């Protein structure tokens, strides 16, 4: 199975086993499975990651502009800031998406994508 | 259009249920704590009146 690390600049944010993982890179949408080719990619500013977690589970994560790395050993995602949908500040993100500062609106839309919308 | 309205109505009914549980316990607390303040004030008025009876006598 996959071994997945989500690493924020301040904290080793998450670590564990997975089956599949979906994300949206600057070259396009992608998803990967245990035998995937070695790769290094950049996420879009409004990106999300969805992990199909082993033992019949899921994760939805908002990601402020991270980089994604792959090798047959392990998948590592390096992130400036991240937030789980199980802790998302949902009331604010609808207003954050309307701001005039490009990255602030993008981080708003990332959290709205983690909220399934 | 009615199937789509049942999905909107289930969300609004759930949100308003949770808001009404929070408001119900809060509304009880507002009245009960106001009565607690009036009980302390009524006690203190009798304490000060009994003190004024001591001073006058």
């Amino acid at each position: 199975d996959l071994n997945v690390e989500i690493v924020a600049v301040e904290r080793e944010l998450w670590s564990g086993p997975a089956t599949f993982v979906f994300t949206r890179t600057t070259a396009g949408e992608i998803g990967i499975l245990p035998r995937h080719i070695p790769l290094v990619a950049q996420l879009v500013d409004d990106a999300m990651v969805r992990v199909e977690r082993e033992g019949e589970d899921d994760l939805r994560i908002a990601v402020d502009g991270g980089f994604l790395s792959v090798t047959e050993e392990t998948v590592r995602i390096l992130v400036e800031n991240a937030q789980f949908e199980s802790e998302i500040d949902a009331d604010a993100a609808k207003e954050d998406a309307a701001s005039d500062d490009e990255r602030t609106a993008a981080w708003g839309r990332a959290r709205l994508r983690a909220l399934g919308q | 259009a009615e199937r789509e309205a049942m999905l909107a109505k289930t969300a609004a009914d759930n949100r308003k249920s949770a808001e009404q549980v929070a408001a119900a316990q809060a509304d009880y607390e507002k009245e009960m704590a106001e009565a607690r303040a009036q009980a302390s004030a009524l006690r203190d008025e009798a304490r000060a009146a009994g003190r004024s009876v001591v001073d006058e006598k």
Partner: protein, 232 residues
């Protein structure tokens, strides 16, 4: 007379309580700061692995990897405490900063100066040199949202070549609880070190050019966490 000495004993007997309390507090805060350094380290080790693996495929022709034809004006960041009582910390930093300004003027460059912390801002306002920008109110607990602003400012000052031809940082390395030192190092332009012997989206040149400013932001962050553990 006895009354003056009884007053001075009352005074000193209070100071001994306050300084013994802050020795014990600082003995806890160095454990919180080391926990934050060791929690921040895993990101920087992985960004370095990713940056070297991209540089292997890249042309190595980004501005931060190429020297100017005739440099005149070099940027320097000094970092320092927002409080006092530190002892030698601010002096060791500012003696190294002046030792560096006398290196740069001995090569033939002149420094332009960026400052973190209210103490160095007080020193470089008593000695009459300007400060280009400064930041205060976080040296006791840095967060990456500050290192971002520092790196953007420095990198936008280098990439303007008003502008600068190089970037340096002055800070203290925490080596161990009993030993630390001020260190000065060149942050830009960067040296490339060849050593004995993937898909990229959308291209390796594009990612390398978008990654280097984020590496500079994580390196200045790692230096701010070493500065805050060393201050305590």
């Amino acid at each position: 007379t006895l009354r003056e000495l009884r007053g001075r004993i009352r005074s000193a007997g209070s100071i001994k309580k306050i300084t013994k309390a802050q020795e014990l507090i600082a003995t806890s805060r160095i454990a919180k700061a080391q926990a934050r350094v060791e929690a921040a380290r895993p990101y920087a080790a992985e960004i370095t692995n990713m940056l070297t693996e991209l540089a292997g495929a890249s042309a190595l022709d980004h501005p931060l990897l190429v020297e100017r034809k005739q440099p005149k004006r070099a940027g320097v960041l000094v970092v320092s405490s927002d409080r006092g009582l530190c002892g030698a910390y601010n002096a060791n930093v500012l003696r190294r900063a002046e030792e560096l300004f006398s290196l740069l003027r001995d090569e033939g460059k002149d420094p332009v100066l960026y400052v973190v912390g209210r103490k160095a801002l007080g020193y470089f306002s008593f000695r009459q040199r300007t400060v280009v920008e400064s930041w205060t109110g976080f040296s006791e607990r840095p967060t990456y949202e500050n290192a971002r602003e520092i790196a953007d400012t420095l990198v936008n000052a280098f990439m303007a070549g008003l502008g600068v031809d190089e970037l340096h940082i002055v800070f203290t390395e925490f080596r161990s609880m009993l030993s630390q030192t001020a260190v000065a190092r060149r942050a830009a332009p960067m040296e490339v070190e060849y050593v004995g012997e993937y898909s990229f989206e959308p291209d390796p040149e594009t990612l390398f050019d978008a990654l280097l400013p984020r590496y500079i932001a994580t390196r200045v962050y790692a230096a701010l966490l070493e500065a805050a553990a060393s201050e305590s």
